[PDB]
Symmetry: C3
Subunit: 161 residues, 3 copies
């Protein structure tokens, strides 16, 4: 599986990128003084700082969207890299996703004009869809009758004794 290291690289970078969104999120909570919890606010000013803020809310939306897209890629990308895909093709799947999700986060936290984020979400979903269909195709091919699987490899049953 020559694809696997490329996948390990792109997926681990994406986790780290997610960890970074987390760090940005806490820093925004500190600067804006907007804590989710009473106990936090007490330690950083008083109860009035237990409140929401638009920038904190945005950071969480970005993080949640990562959870809805990157966690599936971790699973799909893994299984897919054990399916002997073309190595260049697999690199492309992984690079369209990494660059797309990195761009996604920049478009969210940078608040760029619509629909720039919305497009980067869709483009990044493209290789994920592709890997999913391919995995489904291979899983489904496993359960075909053996007579059909043989016919597809050029072998009809012999009537000869």
């Amino acid at each position: 599986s020559p694809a696997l290291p490329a996948f390990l690289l792109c997926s681990t970078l994406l986790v780290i990128k997610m960890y970074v969104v987390a760090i940005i999120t806490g820093q925004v909570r500190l600067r804006k003084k907007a804590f989710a919890n009473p106990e936090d606010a007490l330690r950083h000013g008083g109860p009035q700082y237990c409140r929401s803020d638009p920038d904190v809310e945005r950071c969480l939306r970005a993080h949640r969207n990562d959870m809805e897209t990157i966690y599936p890629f971790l699973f799909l990308g893994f299984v897919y890299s054990f399916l002997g895909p073309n190595p260049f093709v697999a690199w492309m799947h992984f690079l369209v996703f990494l660059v797309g999700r990195v761009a996604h986060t920049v478009a969210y936290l940078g608040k760029l004009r619509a629909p720039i984020r919305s497009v980067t979400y869709t483009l990044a979903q493209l290789p994920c869809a592709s890997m999913a269909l391919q995995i489904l195709w291979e899983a489904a091919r496993h359960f075909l009758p053996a007579a059909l699987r043989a016919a597809l490899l050029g072998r009809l049953r012999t009537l000869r004794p």
Copy 2:
């Protein structure tokens, strides 16, 4: 691992189902005109459409609940299928979960009467619990003293030189 393809099928369908919840969610945002972001709203009417809506909120709750149930199944189901379970039994685990989570989403987005969703959540959690205990049992059996592991396979230590 004859169980693995069945698992790949059920788990990949579940990811796709999650992708579909995502698509429904965006479509509800468009129709109701309820965007999470100022920049989105500007592109689709004006700032007044940066607002929440009950149907959008529901879609997100459904999606989040998928994240809390399906992502663990992706991990548990994978490891479990490498534990040589009975193939029919493993199919049942995977089918009770797939059908249960599909039913769950129908009960949420369809807004069926309580407690229909709540039941489908619980029934679907059943095979997940089962796989988890089994994985824990196998992981734990690995760390037993060797003398106890041998005794359980009928072998007591010999006093003979």
Copy 3:
């Protein structure tokens, strides 16, 4: 991979712990009578019980934070245990995380004084960062030129025919 069973143990316990947060969450919804859905509230009193509550909100924050930390550990910890790390070192990575995340949840649901939770989140992130860098290092070492990889193993190219 002697590390793998230790990982299976710590990771499956963490999933179960997450399932427990889920159960606590529903029980808090019942006692406080704070349901996310109109249909739920009808079955447990009336529409006035379709409302938020501070304790329900906290439970969800705890659960979400698990999703942002434990799901990556499931992926990182798996890959890492196939990297032949020292078995004791790997046990430490897995135990600092398990104990840290268990402590995290106690600090959230128990509402302990700031910044006790915030510290336990950070300490638990430590072995995750470590595993990630190590995975990145191994994935990156794979793509170095072969001449550099050989030099690092003591082999320069021979000019001899």
